[PDB]
Amino acid sequence: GVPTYLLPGSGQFLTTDDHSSAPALPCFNPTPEMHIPGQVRNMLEVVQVESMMEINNTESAVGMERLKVDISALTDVDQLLFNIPLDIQLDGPLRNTLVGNISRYYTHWSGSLEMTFMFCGSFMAAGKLILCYTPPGGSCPTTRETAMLGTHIVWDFGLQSSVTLIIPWISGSHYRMFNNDAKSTNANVGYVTCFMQTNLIVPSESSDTCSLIGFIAAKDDFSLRLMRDSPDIGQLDHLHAAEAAYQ
C-alpha cells in the first residue's frame, strides 16, 4: 500500500493541537445558530472595556471601600493622594480588572493602558488633580515636583468628572514578561501617581470626603500572547458534589 513511517510525536496527546476527530454522533443536526447579543470573537473585546481599580487595597477598607479612593480637603500644599503599581500580570490594584484577570491567562503583553478616574463628589465640589504616569527605572515619585516631569494630565472638577489617562506603551521590547519579578526591566511598567494640583474645596454643606473611582481599560493597540494558566484561581481538593456527578 502506502509506505509510511511514524515520526517522533506519534501517539502523543498534545492538548493544544488542531486535528479533527471521529464524531460520536453521526448525521447529528445541531441547533440552528440564533443571533444572541454580544458575541465575543476575540478576548481583547473583554479587555478594552473599562473596569474598576482597587486602588484602596489597604487594611481597614472592608469590602466595597476598596474600589473608591477617599480624597479630602488638605491644609498642606501638594500632597500625594495615591499611587498605583502598574503590573497587570502581578498582584496589585490592576489584578481584579478586565485588563488584569484576562492578562493573567497570558505571559507577554503589549499595548497602551487607559485609566479613567471618575470623581464622585458633589456638584459644588471644585478642585484640580494631576495624574502622573512615571516610566520606570527610579522610585515612585513622592513629591509633585518629581512626578510632573513624567507623562501627566491636569484635571479640573468642572463639568469634567472623568478623564482618559493614556498610559502610553513605553518599553524597549515588543512585549513584557511575568517571570515572578516586578522589578525586572522586562516586566516593570512604571508608576501612576496622583497629587493635589490645587485642593479639594467644598462648601459647608457638601461632604468633604469625596471619592475617586478609578477605571482601567486597554487601547486598540493592546496585545497578549503566550497563554498560561490563571494564578488567580486554584484548587486543593475536589469541589463539593463533584463526586455526585459520578453517582
Binding site: T134, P135, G137, T146, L149, I170, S171, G172, H174
Partner: protein, 230 residues
C-alpha cells in the same frame, strides 16, 4: 574631519561595524507609541574619556557603552531623564608615539560582552561590570575575560592601531540589540575593548604614551521622559 556637533577631529580609514551605519529608529520597527526625542547635536558629538597609560605591563582596557557615557554631558542628562535609549557610536581610539616605538592595539568593539570571573563560579557583580567612565582593566585579555579567545576576537567589529602604520582607530557602531530601544542604566550593548597584542617597546627615552578614547554617540533617540535617577 570627523565633525559631529560642535566636536571635531582632524585625521589623515574607519570600520562600519557589521557594514551598518547608525541611523535613527525606523517607524515600522518602532515600538513606543510616542515620538522619540532626538538631541541631534547635543549628544551626537565626541565625548572624550580619561586617557589610560599604555605601559609595558599593561593587559588591556574595556569601556562598556553607554555605561562609559551615562554621566557625561547632555548625553548623560538625556540618559538619566529618559527611560528608553537607542544610539550608535563612533568610537575614535587614538594613540600615537614616535617613529621609534613599536606596538599593536586590538581596538575591538565587542557586542554584548558578558564577562566572567576567573577561578570562581559566582557571576560578576554590579560593581565588576558597571565601572562607568573609568572603565576596567582586563584580568585575562588573552581569553577576553569570558573564556573565549582573543585570537578569534577579530570576528568582532574592530581594526588595529599599529604604531608602525597608523595612530588612530575609528569604529562606527550601529544599534546592536535584539530590542529597538533599551534601558541604558542596566544594559551595555557594546564594549570597546583595547588590548596590547604587541606591547609598547622602544629604546629611546621613555615618554608617557597614553591612549585617549573619544566616543561620539550617533543617532541618539530617547523615550520615557521623567525625573532623573543619577
Amino acid at each position: 574631519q570627523l565633525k559631529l556637533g560642535n566636536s571635531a577631529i582632524v585625521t589623515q580609514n574607519y570600520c562600519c561595524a557589521y557594514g551598518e551605519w547608525p541611523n535613527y529608529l525606523p517607524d515600522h520597527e518602532a515600538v513606543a507609541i510616542d515620538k522619540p526625542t532626538q538631541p541631534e547635536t547635543a549628544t551626537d558629538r565626541f565625548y572624550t574619556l580619561k586617557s589610560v597609560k599604555w605601559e609595558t605591563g599593561s593587559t588591556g582596557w574595556w569601556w562598556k557603552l553607554p555605561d562609559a557615557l551615562n554621566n557625561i554631558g547632555m548625553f548623560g542628562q538625556n540618559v538619566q531623564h529618559h527611560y528608553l535609549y537607542r544610539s550608535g557610536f563612533l568610537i575614535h581610539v587614538q594613540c600615537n608615539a614616535t617613529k621609534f616605538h613599536q606596538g599593536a592595539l586590538l581596538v575591538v568593539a565587542i557586542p554584548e560582552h558578558q564577562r566572567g570571573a576567573h577561578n570562581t563560579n559566582t557571576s560578576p557583580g554590579f560593581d565588576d561590570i558597571m565601572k562607568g567612565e573609568e572603565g576596567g582593566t582586563f584580568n585575562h585579555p588573552y581569553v577576553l575575560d569570558d573564556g573565549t579567545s582573543l585570537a578569534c576576537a577579530t570576528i568582532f567589529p574592530h581594526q588595529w592601531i599599529n604604531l608602525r602604520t597608523n595612530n588612530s582607530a575609528t569604529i562606527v557602531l550601529p544599534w546592536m540589540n535584539a530590542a529597538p530601544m533599551d534601558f541604558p542604566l542596566r544594559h551595555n550593548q557594546w564594549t570597546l575593548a583595547i588590548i596590547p597584542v604587541v606591547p609598547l617597546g622602544t629604546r629611546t627615552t621613555s615618554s608617557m604614551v597614553p591612549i585617549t578614547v573619544s566616543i561620539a554617540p550617533m543617532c541618539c533617540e530617547f523615550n520615557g521622559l521623567r525625573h532623573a535617577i543619577t
